[PDB]
Structure formats: structure tokens, C-alpha cells
Amino acid sequence: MEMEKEFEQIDKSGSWAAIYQDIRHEASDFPSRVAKLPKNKNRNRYRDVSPFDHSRIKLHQEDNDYINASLIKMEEAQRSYILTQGPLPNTVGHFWEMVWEQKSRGVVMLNRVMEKGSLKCAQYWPQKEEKEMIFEDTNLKLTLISEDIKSYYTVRQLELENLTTQETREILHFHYTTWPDFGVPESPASFLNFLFKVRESGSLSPEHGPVVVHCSAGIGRSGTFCLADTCLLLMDKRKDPSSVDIKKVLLEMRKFRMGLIQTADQLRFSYLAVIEGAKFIM
Template sequence: MAPKPKKKSSKFSGGKGRLSRESKPVKWIESMAVDMIVTLKKISSEYYHELPNRPDAHEARLFYKNIPTRRNRYGDIPCLDKTRVALIDARDGNDYIHANWVTMPNARCRYIMTQAPLPETTADFWSMVWQENVSLIVCLTKIFEQGKMKTLEYWPTSCGKQFHQKHGHVHIRNVGVRNEPHFALTLLEAVNEKSMERRKIQHYLYLDWPDHRVPICTHNFLQVVRYVDEEIANYKGKEPMTIVVHCSAGVGRSGTLVALQSLVGSVNEGQVPQVCQVVSMVRKQRAMAVQGPEQYLFLYWALTVHITSCCQIPLEAKKDLLKRLVLMKNCSTKSACSLSPITTDQPDAATSSARQARNEDGGDRKRRPSNVKRKTPRGSVTVRKSKP
């Protein structure tokens, strides 16, 4: 079992707070903007010389042992023994799954970073979700990318009893789904056929991030961070919330999200974000997290966008600051994101949907996306189609 994280509240939770111009995060981005060439060289040096590299073979013995069992999606992405999730209800006596516990100092949750399920591992995946009482799954990969399957469709993507799936001892049904251009938010009902216990699990599918690259839109990805933060803040369970994060390999995109979640938390507390330190911490628990200098540099750019969005400086000053930092954006993401800072006062579609679901159902135990109607007189669940 993973160690329990320390509970820590954020006075700027969800990006709603305001950083003064004299705050450490604002001073941090202003210092980076003084000479972007020097800044980019420093960031590049951090990535190539200061981060933990590929672990030694003896640190991932079970990963190599399980190569013949076809439980590893990729042969070059090791799973560390010291932080691995061990299956209690193991099939064939093998408790291995390519998944690691990741805990961060300022997090109010526990992360499980894992690879996308395979046909051979989907039952193990759902066994892990049930075993660790996971209430949120964040999927950062499309099912198919560039003609290749990046993840098995391990959850029912359509709503209705006829679309249920069964993996091992767990039955999964889609209770409702909200489809948006860059994400799909699904409420799943999982039933353990042994105990007949029922649980609700949120599934957030992010669609705006190509493999081995960075998010297409920085603003949209920061909405994912705010959505996860709000789900954590509203969690009412006795134990810390457990969140599964996966992409295809479970290291690049997944590591970037977990690292950014922690870094944004530090910024919201008025601290200078320690990017290299945080990524190192993630990599020591999930090997090779944050893949490539592009993803590493994106963390700096995303933090810049977040800080300028929630700091108390004149709009023109924000725009000028972002223009001086535009080289960082161009080196990390080729997106068409506007350089204009965005406001974080209004909740995005995902957080609004989850919030309304909690209000309608009286808490986290019965959450439902906002575009899903309650039971009709016939007892069926209907979903409104999103506008084209």
C-alpha cells in the first residue's frame, strides 16, 4: 500500500486565488523573461544532466521477469519494484501489474501511474482499481493514434445496460457521458460480482495530446489540472483519494500531468515552482516519467500561463510578459493558443459538469455528469447529445 499523503489545503485551490506582483511565482517568471536564451539553456541542462535516468535492471526485476507473460505494453519502459502496485487478488499467483504508486509532498491524493490496459491485463487493471478504491481515472491517450491502438477500450464508451463490460470479477456500466471537443467525462458504475458492492468512478478521457508530444492547447490542459484539483477538494472519503493516471506507456503524458498538478499546487501556495526537483521526485517513483525535453519545457510554459492567469498585474503587463516568453512556447508547443492570459474565475466544462453532478446527487458517492438525465419513469438512463 502507498503511504498516506499529508493533507494540505491550498488557499489558491482551483486557480481562483490571486498572486500579487511581488509574489515569488510572478518574480520567477519575470526573471526567466530577462534573457530567454539563457533560460532555455538552463532548462535544457536540467533535463539532460540533473534528472534521474533509466533505472538499473536490478531495480525492476519483476518487469523483466514478466516480459514473457505479455503484461508489459513496451519492452523499454521499466516498472520500478520499490513503488509497484501489488495485486492482492492475483490471477495465476502473479501479483504483477505495470503500475506504480506516486505520492507528492503537497498532494491531497495518491496517484497510481500505469500503462494503458492490454487484452492480457485489463482484468488486472480493474482488479487494481477495485482493490485501491479508485474514484477517478484520467486517460490521456486516444484509443487509436496515427493508426495504432494506444489503449484497449477497457470501459463502455456508450451509455446503457446493453453496453456493459466485465473484466475479471468487476462489471462496468456507463451511467452517463459528456462529450466535448477536447475531453469526454464518463460516470461509470462498477460492481464486484463477489461482494455485489457498487461504486461510482469518474473517467476523464483527454483528447488533445499527441503521443510523445505536448498538449495541443495549454489552456485546455490546465483545465484538466483544475478539474482534478476540484475533484480532490470535493472528495468526502475517509481515506485520501486515489487517482489512476495513464496514457499509453504511462510515463510521458502521465508524468507531465502529475508533475504539473504538484507544481501548480506549489504556485497556488505562493511558492517558486521547483520543476527539476518535482520531476526528479516523480521519476524516482515512476521510471522515465516526463518523456523528452519538449514535455519538460512544456511544464515551464504551462506554469507561466497559469501564473499570468491568476496574478494581480495589469492586463497589458501580462501580455507583455507573455510576449517576452513566447520563445519558450514556440520551443515546447506549436499550438495556436492565444498569448492573452485567461481568467480562472469561471469553471470550465468538466468542473462545472462534476460540480453539478455532486449537487444533484448529494455528494461524491453518486456523481453524474451534468448532461445526463436522472432515471426516467421507465428506469432508463438517457444522455443528451452534445451540440455540434
Template sequence: MELERAQTIQEFVKSIEKRNFEFEFQYLRQSTETKEHDKQLIKTVQVQRLNRYSNILPFSHSIVKPEAQSTNKFSTPRDKFYINANYIKGINNVEKQYIATQGPIPESIDDFWHMVWTNNVGVVIMLCALFDRGRIQCEKYWPSQGQKAQFGPYEVNTISQEEAPKTFFKNKIILRCQDEQREILHFQWAGWTDFGVVDNSQFKILDMLAEVSNTAGMQNKRPVVHCSAGVGRTGTFLAICHIKQLLINNQAKISVFSIVRRLREQRALMIQTPEQYQMVYRYTIWLIENLKYI
């Protein structure tokens, strides 16, 4: 299919003005929101209380589980663990390079930190405010600077916080379980509204976060990415991470359509609007220009 065909950077740039983003996005929806996809969603009644939104469900084939090598005696039995999160492949089909998930709710915070611990997560990227558009977007699952909180067997200690600009926060967290401790970097960007897009002037923030995520993934410090539902902003950001990895090479070939389709095969509904889909194209052009490839 022509939309799937990867283009050289020069071809990609030339094709931008001819693209019908609305058409491409609707075609993506038709091909990734089928009855067969619906069958793969986890709809078990017993876990519905752990989903933030009743219509945003994880696929069974890529759902996140505690890694088998965990020696933590508090590890939840694998058949009883549930979190609304999916593993996402990197470019070249690198398995489980990222985790995409919803913003935790009060009932899922313990399992969120269990996921972080047992998946050797080193970075958490939070792409939402705690409250937006008149409703709670995410439960605050980490303590304020200088404070500790206990979530199941995990002690969470925020030892430092940086703020710059006003909507961007970087927290350094120490996560402890039994006699072991690990450092987690937690980035929160609250400048991207629910269902929204950002303009080109804010791409520097996204680009920096994509660099952090990609570096962590390549160092086996698997990054967790979430917004509120874990599909719109999260999907858009992960597409940007893929684009950034591809464009390390100025001989790269690009198909945004193919990248987004693959994301939607791993977590349902990734990228929710035509505007978010178009935003991935805008970022790609921005990055190509900043890398001086054209």
C-alpha cells in the same frame, strides 16, 4: 545543487528566460536512468506479456499491488498480481496519492479493474486516444454508454457520457463486485498526441483535470492516470498536478527540476522529451498569471 533549489514565485518567473531546458532535461536523464535504477525495474519473463511496451517497465519499490485491507473473496493473491503501474507521492511526500500506469492491453484489463477496486480509486484520467500515430494506444477497457461488461469478478457499467469538446469525454461508471458497487469518474482527453505537447490554449483542460485528480487524492479516492506507456504525457500531467497543489499558496517555492526528478525516481522515464519538460514550465507561468500572483 542549484537546479534542485526551490525558488520563490518572483525568482522563478525571472529565471525562465535564462533556462536551458535541453541541458536540464539531459541532466535529469543522466541522474535518473542509471544502472542502479535499471536494477530496480521488474524484468520477470513471466509478466512481459502484460507490458504494452517492452522498454517501459515499473520499478519494484513502488509497483502497485492490491491493498491488504481488501475483503473481496476474488482478490488475486498478492504474489501473483502484476500490473505495469506505480504509486506516486503527492507534495510533502504524501504516500500513494496517485497511480501512474500504462494504457491497458487485452490481457491486463481484468487486473486494471482489480487495481481500481482494491485501491479505492475514484477517478481515472486517460490522456490518449485509443488509436494514434498508426498504432493502438490503449485497449477500450470500459463499455459504451448504457452497456455493461464483465472483467473477471467485476461488472463495469457506463451509465452516462458527456462530450465537450470533441476530444474530451466524461464517463460515469458503476463498478460492481459481489453485492458492493462504487461510482468511478472516467475522463478521457484525446487531444494530446503521443510524445507531443499542448499549447497554452489547452491548459484550461489540463488545469481542470489536475484539480479533479488532486481533489480525489486528498479525499482518499486515489486517482489513476494513464496515457499509452504511462510515462510521457502521464509524467507531464503529474508534474502539473504537483505544481497546481504547490501554487495554492502564493508564498510557494518551486523547483520543476526537483519535482520531475522525484517522479522519475518513482516511475521510470516519466516525461520523455525536453519539450514536455518545458511544457511544465509553460503551464507554471500560465497558472501564476491566472492566479494573478504577478
């Protein structure tokens, strides 16, 4: 079926939970043996969220190459994304090592450091220009260059230096700051505006490594971001845009990371975002 009328048909029939459970039933199951080794217990935020072995990002280290991060490679859309958990106190150095080694331009953050009165990820970037961060385990230096605070999101320019080679690179930090503690946003307008800002920066484009996107676990809000982007790109590329099947795209992405889209409300919000976004594109 088309998207917008399939949408109204699920709303009128109140069957979002059944649609979402079908997706969960049909989703791929691949091994994640490296994530479950005992030496990696303190490298995982949640015991039921792990990268598959076949798609996990490997750190360029001989001691322990593990990080909780997956490469999502969308072949027809010609887009790639790295989805990862919010960094932990003992993995902030690993995080910036991955950004360096994979040649990423942008980092997309979809959570606040504290939500619901608890810490959802480490404070992994510097908050003042004159107070830079040094990660001694991975030999990197990170400096805040500028910050632009808007009503729904903040964009930061960062400098990442590899202290071993003295090479430097500019990283863009796109921080969506207004996703509600509970539930999903009522309108997709600010989320779409944010996606378009990431796009306009060049961070999603083939001349750079894959964008790094995270929330707390790296599957819920993160999944929404890449699902909406990929669906809108396919609607532009194809002769028949109504052929784009958001459930099929989601199942394809779930071949690369488990659990993408965590609730039926997130599923409905993804439909809403693609629907409204398709109108603005033209």
C-alpha cells in the same frame, strides 16, 4: 532561480536539450525485478518501461500480483497518484481490479485508443449504456452511466460492481482527447482547464484512493499531468511561491517511476503550464 525567468533564459539560450539530459543523468535507478520475470512478459507494453519494485502496485491475488503501475507519493504536497500504462488486451481485468482494490474515484486518460495509425491501448470501457462489460478473470462488471463530450475532453460516469460481494461504486473517467499525435500542445490553456475539472470532481482528494492516470506508456503525458498539479499545489501552500523548483519536483517524482517526462518539449510544456496556471489561481 525563479521559474518564469529561468524559462526565458533557457529559450533565449536554446538549451532545453541540455537541461533535460541533466535530469536524465541525475534520476534515480532502482530495481524492477518483478516486472522482468518471464511470466510477466505479456503484462508489459514496452520492454524499457517498468515499475520499480519498491513502489509498484500489487494486485490482491496469490497467483500473480503483477501490474505495470507505480504509486507516486508526494509528501509535502500531500498528494498521491497511481501512474500506469494503457491497458493491454490481457490486462484490462487487472486494471479494473486495481481501481477497485485501491479505492480510486477517478481515472485520467491522456491518449486516444488509436494514434499514428496504431493501437495505443485497449478499448477498456463500454461505449453504450445497454452494452456493459464483464471481466471474468477478476469478477467485475462495468457499465456506462452517462457521457459528456466537450471540445477538448470527455467526462464519463461509470458503475463498477464487484460481482463477488455485489458492492457497487461510481467511477469518473476524465478523457483528454486532443493531445496532438506529434509534439505538444501550442498553448497549455485546454490542459489546465482539464486539470481543474479533475480537481473539482473530488478525484484527487484525500477522502478517496489515489487517482489512476495513464497514457500509452504511463510516463510522458502522465508525468506532465502530475508534475503540473503538484507544482501548483506547492505554490499555494508555501510562504514563498517562487521557491518551487520544477526540476527538483520532477526528480522527486522519478524516485517512484522511471522516465517521467519523455522529451525536452514535454519539459518545456510543463514549465509553460505551471507558469500560466499560477496566474489564474490568483
